[PDB]
Design a binder for this molecule. Structure first.
Ligand SMILES: *Cc1c(COP(=O)(O)O)cnc(C)c1O
Ligand SMILES: *Cc1c(COP(=O)(O)O)cnc(C)c1O
Ligand SMILES: *Cc1c(COP(=O)(O)O)cnc(C)c1O
Ligand SMILES: *Cc1c(COP(=O)(O)O)cnc(C)c1O
Ligand SMILES: *Cc1c(COP(=O)(O)O)cnc(C)c1O
Ligand SMILES: *Cc1c(COP(=O)(O)O)cnc(C)c1O
Ligand SMILES: [Cl-]
Ligand SMILES: [Cl-]
Ligand SMILES: [Cl-]
Ligand SMILES: [Cl-]
Ligand SMILES: [Cl-]
Ligand SMILES: [Cl-]
Ligand SMILES: [Cl-]
Ligand SMILES: [Cl-]
Ligand SMILES: [Cl-]
Ligand SMILES: [Cl-]
Ligand SMILES: [Cl-]
Ligand SMILES: [Cl-]
Ligand SMILES: [Cl-]
Ligand SMILES: [Cl-]
Ligand SMILES: [Cl-]
Ligand SMILES: [Cl-]
Ligand SMILES: [Cl-]
Ligand SMILES: [Cl-]
Ligand code: NA
Ligand code: NA
Ligand code: NA
Ligand code: NA
Ligand code: NA
Ligand code: NA
Ligand code: NA
Ligand code: NA
Ligand code: NA
Ligand code: NA
Ligand code: NA
Ligand code: NA
Ligand code: NA
Ligand code: NA
Ligand code: NA
Ligand code: NA
Ligand code: NA
Ligand code: NA
Lengths: 309, 309, 309, 309, 309, 309
């Protein structure tokens, strides 16, 4: 049912002790920023591998800085709390860890910088799909993606998902599995919760970060693996909508989405299938990396030894 | 300390019974919409007057519809729950009532329409400033207001305040009391939490609703009282930034802000002071209306008889 | 099968004589502008009534002027050619008349002003739905409406329908009957082939012409009939997307669309149904006008006497 | 006078057999997409060389896919039909071949995907200017170029030329030979019918494809020849208006425009003349390629042997 | 040759005494704001009439406030200095008076608020064209008008004319007499130095002030005279480009431009000529007002008695 | 006090001879363009080094061409006049030289191309800060930077500083030392008078020129020295606002600003200080270059031998 423990404001406590009032933190949620961090269980080694833990903890500290939450936690403390909780929960399987930071005020509309900074971290069992061949049908939304002018997508804020839900609602009631966004200038931005890649003529193409997207750690991982293991050309550039309809392959990528193939966009089918050949190679490489079976990428992994069963 | 009771999912319960897990509803908060409703205590009558209760309950139902929360509550139930809670709390003074509606999912990123609709209402003591002459110094923010393209301001969503906090943070660290917004086209929109009025040459001027603002009930109340009691011309139109610097008077208005005078905007002083003469007349008229001493506007008030002490 | 005749370049000819080469006029079609004009057959009088013939002929002359087609035809000639063809075709039933003007060049990319101006007019049986209660489900498109910057919607050009087809394709493959457009600023513009009206709180609301819409003769007719026969308030203004979702009623209007009720927009249902009460009154008034049974609006009708069977 | 034959819907027929009704296909023209393909006659070899035939046929298939025309023709069929028609016409000189694809509906406003796909191909004598030194005076138009938001320039649609004609009309009545466009953001896009290059400080500069331009085969050819034969730096980037006024050289390029020098832009003269030195080298290289006298680029040519007179 | 006197920094001095260094005030000119005020000589009365002197002096004080020039001069002082200089110059004919205010700094880039405020006023003979029937041919520029985002057009700043000169240069080298501007959204704004009016179907139409135009005193005068003397409908609204091409009449208006008829716009001719009938009535009414022969508008005039020769 | 001489319209004259009327050139200032050129005095050599004199003179000639000032001066004449004036002034210390070109008309609003071109050059003692460690606190302005649509930033026009002063006024009254600008699309552009650099993860980042910035000679110098002397990666790209808040270092650069460290942006502190390590290396390299003690960059220097005291 529930995990054994969670971390809250510098301490690990039993789950059933973290009880709050219904009315606590609704205003704090407007400030809230989060990470999603993966743990992958290698039963042959008896070790959990936490993927790019310090990169996620540094992004959370940056998101907190841009919200203007007062300084209270460190990068090393968030990394250590993640290790400690995965160990103490004693769950030997794939997990998601979610730090969530929030600033709490004396008044509903006090400025963030006058608030108190708080954080919890919780870890729960996750289901990987990296050993499954599946694909989604996407649409481009009639809703526009937030930009730096109004709500910087660089900040991994809960509030940014209100714009996401406009698109994901539309996609589901219009017969699609997932939405892609255009930015205010009309250029391809990202999915509702992950970055998008395209494959055309043996090249990987992905929107550049100033297209108004979150600076994904999975996106970075995929560009590295595509260049260094497969020797592919990867272009980070402005991407137009109609060119994506002619993509040989396409996929979403994100800590939660892992590598998720796109079969079609607005009912234009990816010519080489889903997962396409290059997608399938990147999915297999990614999997072997995160489960600790690719020594070349060991510096991306934080092992937590727990015992081999 | 705490109110005696609150309302939750169709029931009134003692405050200390509304306990939840720390991890409950963070994802639901992305969906959340709310109202702020005023109760004004008339000790001479022993009655609380709840201001434009049905208008607030209908706006909440509209906000919920635009979020796409499944149907669960009615306008009449939200009006009745507000009356019941103000009575049962037995607090004989000015109050704020806040309904907050949220949709809760099986998964973090399930579409809103597959969720369950929930709501609470809580009522707490409020401090009116309608018998005080005070004023704020405003700036125009370097952050842009959300528009219909990305996050419709018509929806009174918690998430819309993330954009608000960009502006209110900037205002406070730059020596101002409050921020005003420009819309993406560069035209004057609203404050961070209330609508803005200007007075120039004996006329009231306010941004039209398609300038990208919340359709305020206080804004509506002020236009009615300005036209019907004072016989003023009121223009709802596109408003430019530099014209506001030459305003004779200016004020913010909102359920929480009541009528809040603006002394200056980007260090251009309102020529007729703050509160200016027309501002002061509207503030006095508003006060007499909401405290039940203006029979002409009785249809805006819901009395809750509680006993005269 | 085919009509008896058509009009071409100042002459009426038998249908089967208007034969051209497959390769003729493809480049001319880029220039082409058109009207759709209704004839309504009153069997009790033995008369066809052609609706607002001179207004349609003047709009065609304006469209031709803005294309910069050399002067060749007159308003009176287009009105007379329409009368003559409806008479000579000897078809005693409702019809559509379509003038189509085009400029033909010596070279593919010669400037319009160096071309020759040509025109045909043809008339075919039409099916009215004014005695039927039906409704469409609409979406807002993810494709943006053309504006004055790139392709003025005031010009009733064939080429403007390429932008229309982006929206109408999307609507049909996404489970809808019809698309509505947003303009580049994000404000409600028009349908793919007709103007849109909304009814809310007993008022009619329609986008103002500078929202980037064709200046519809049906739109003008509806505003006149709503004000003069029903005494309704009609606002021509900037209209936001989410406000339309809360419309009590909505309808499309156009020479071809007559008065077409909208039941829902992006799966938000019009609260008072489709056709709603005000829609149903305007549809009945419109019908009685165009079939010549409303003496008040006789100056909008051009009778063509043909014999009462 | 007329060519002997043309191709229509999978068949070659004598020209005078391709007769249609005046009223046929005006609505189909809104859907229509086309290619312009060059044949260059080498009298010393008795061979026509058709330039980048498969690239043009693949672009036509992509344009047809983005229109959503049902599948009916193949890339190989369009390549073969082009060869067959050039041979059967027995015209031993430079030619233009124009495929034109169109979708035909039961009703005026049926969705493209419910239509029937049709196509013709015709070939006519062309005049090359590759052995002539000439130049055009250009202006930047006051009309804006279509973008992906409203009418994707990637689609080689007849309708896109309505926006072209706004600019080319203005240029001719204002004393210029040709118009250049700015995109909605104000950046340099393309000519009315061809891409634009600039030369400054020995470098070639051209707008990147996401500046909102057609992905020209001549543009691709010029970048290849500039890099591979001349060893020039070529930048594909965002280009500003005023920087173009300081260009040492400039030229238009396109299947129809071949390589067309620009002497001046808004009455700012290209400092190194027109054709400038680098322009003149690219024009001479291009010519030798397309007439089959550059063995290095033979894979771009489809020979059609016809006999050496 | 030169006027006898000018006013400078609170004093009238002989012209030849106002000598400065070549290097003085170039940086101050970036700050500079001005008015153009008309004096009209009535030889029958021996009086100069200065038109709407206080309105011009109040606009100058507002422009100075928005620049943030320190307070140094008053509205009454600028009105009195104008009277005094017109009298002391002893020139009995039509004149232009130009106040020019500037802030002077210790350093090139010191902030305006740390500078010293200075002003001169000079008066010179002017030529009225109010007794002449003439007309200009206009174009719409390919250059965009400044908006509130970058350079508020409400401020009558010298620097705003750099944007004007982009348009007026283009107009003259392209064969036109004058340029009109579109705003960044593509809507009609103003001329390079005056506001624009259109006449269509017996109504006057002019861009609303938030279209991004200077709040002209001549514009205000024309709307008053059109409504009050002619009983015309005047619409201040958003105006589209192509609708202006169909105007029956059009004219520029401004203190310097008086009432200047427009014969054509982008080679679309105003149907009722130039000056058209309504234009000609407004020109005659304006003239009789400013020369002091319309008692109804006497409160707009400041007489300066000088002697009747 | 004053320099001995200045250059004016092809001649050197004693300072006190360059006297003009107060009313001369205010309209000419709208046209005016300028350069700021540095002279650095090396007392050990008895030589002034004028930095990138020909690059500055060529930019001035380009600015003059884009204004459309008639041809009157040459690049070589402006270079020679600068040398001559620095020599004749006999001032042995660091100097600023400012050429200022202006077009003078017969009438206030004559087109620039009908005017006369004039120019002066003056040289004055300057204070270098290259031997000082200092830093500025910056904000991003609520005012938008001019773009190519309205006032091309490529032109180094006095009028462009009116937009600058909106930002620099706001910065000073809001407690900051200096303002940075966002462009109309919301991307980082430049400072009020200089370009901006960022350092993050050992890389230099600066907005690309089409972000709407002046093509700075100091910017070019810094990119050259960073790549060639330090071996740093330098990215010229679109830059987002929030990424700049996370910069390790930042600095302004310009002929007047030399290399000016930024300690903070909107109260986000540059993590590695100000001047940071890479900033400090570039400042020291720049200094040694301009004072003639780096033989590698001698071709950037124009020596003027004056005698070693
Ligand atoms: C979190 C997130 C991503 C993916 O980031 P990773 O670091 O790869 O998990 C992409 N888009 C959005 C909107 C996100 O919130
Ligand atoms: C709630 C709110 C207002 C004021 O609305 P009332 O109905 O007058 O309380 C104004 N602006 C915003 C952004 C709001 O959230
Ligand atoms: C023709 C048309 C209409 C309707 O115009 P009527 O004069 O009412 O037929 C509306 N929208 C568009 C795009 C049209 O082409
Ligand atoms: C066809 C076309 C071009 C040139 O394309 P090529 O493949 O080089 O012929 C350029 N611009 C536009 C708008 C076009 O239609
Ligand atoms: C001064 C000016 C006008 C006209 O203003 P009046 O008060 O009528 O002289 C119009 N447009 C611009 C840009 C101006 O500078
Ligand atoms: C002059 C200037 C700069 C710096 O240019 P340098 O050639 O380095 O002096 C930067 N920004 C603006 C706006 C400028 O006017
Ligand atoms: Cl809270
Ligand atoms: Cl540990
Ligand atoms: Cl990499
Ligand atoms: Cl939840
Ligand atoms: Cl009750
Ligand atoms: Cl009212
Ligand atoms: Cl044709
Ligand atoms: Cl007749
Ligand atoms: Cl009406
Ligand atoms: Cl057809
Ligand atoms: Cl063959
Ligand atoms: Cl290449
Ligand atoms: Cl100065
Ligand atoms: Cl006096
Ligand atoms: Cl009036
Ligand atoms: Cl001058
Ligand atoms: Cl010398
Ligand atoms: Cl370099
Ligand atoms: Na701890
Ligand atoms: Na498809
Ligand atoms: Na490791
Ligand atoms: Na209940
Ligand atoms: Na002030
Ligand atoms: Na009541
Ligand atoms: Na005829
Ligand atoms: Na619904
Ligand atoms: Na009639
Ligand atoms: Na065949
Ligand atoms: Na020139
Ligand atoms: Na070949
Ligand atoms: Na005085
Ligand atoms: Na004309
Ligand atoms: Na008077
Ligand atoms: Na000289
Ligand atoms: Na800080
Ligand atoms: Na040198």
């Amino acid at each position: 049912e529930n995990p054994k423990y969670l971390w809250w404001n510098h301490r690990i406590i039993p789950w059933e002790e973290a009880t709050v009032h219904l009315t606590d933190y609704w205003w704090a949620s407007v400030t809230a920023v989060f990470e999603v961090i993966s743990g992958y269980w290698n039963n042959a080694e008896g070790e959990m591998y936490i993927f790019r833990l310090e990169d996620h903890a540094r992004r959370l500290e940056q998101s907190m800085q841009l919200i203007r939450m007062p300084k209270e936690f460190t990068v090393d403390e968030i990394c250590q709390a993640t290790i400690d909780l995965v160990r103490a929960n004693d769950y030997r399987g794939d997990v998601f860890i979610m730090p969530l930071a929030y600033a709490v005020g004396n008044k509903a509309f006090s400025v963030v910088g006058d608030r108190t900074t708080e954080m919890f971290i919780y870890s729960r069992p996750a289901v990987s799909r990296l050993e499954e061949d599946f694909s989604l049908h996407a649409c481009y939304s009639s809703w526009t993606r937030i930009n730096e002018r109004v709500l910087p997508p660089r900040i991994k804020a809960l509030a940014n998902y209100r714009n996401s839900q406009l698109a994901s609602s539309e996609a589901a009631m219009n017969g699609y599995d997932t939405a892609l966004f255009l930015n205010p200038e009309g250029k391809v931005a990202e999915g509702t919760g992950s970055c998008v890649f395209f494959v055309r003529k043996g090249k990987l193409i992905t929107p550049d970060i100033t297209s108004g997207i979150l600076e994904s750690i999975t996106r970075d991982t995929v560009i590295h693996l595509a260049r260094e293991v497969l020797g592919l050309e990867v272009e980070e550039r402005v991407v137009d909508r109609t060119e994506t309809y002619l993509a040989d392959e396409a996929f979403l990528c994100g800590t939660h989405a892992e590598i998720t193939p796109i079969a079609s966009i607005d009912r234009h089918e990816m010519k080489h299938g889903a997962p396409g050949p290059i997608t399938r190679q990147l999915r297999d490489i990614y999997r072997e990396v995160v489960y600790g079976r690719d020594f070349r990428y060991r510096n991306w992994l934080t092992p937590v030894g727990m015992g081999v069963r």
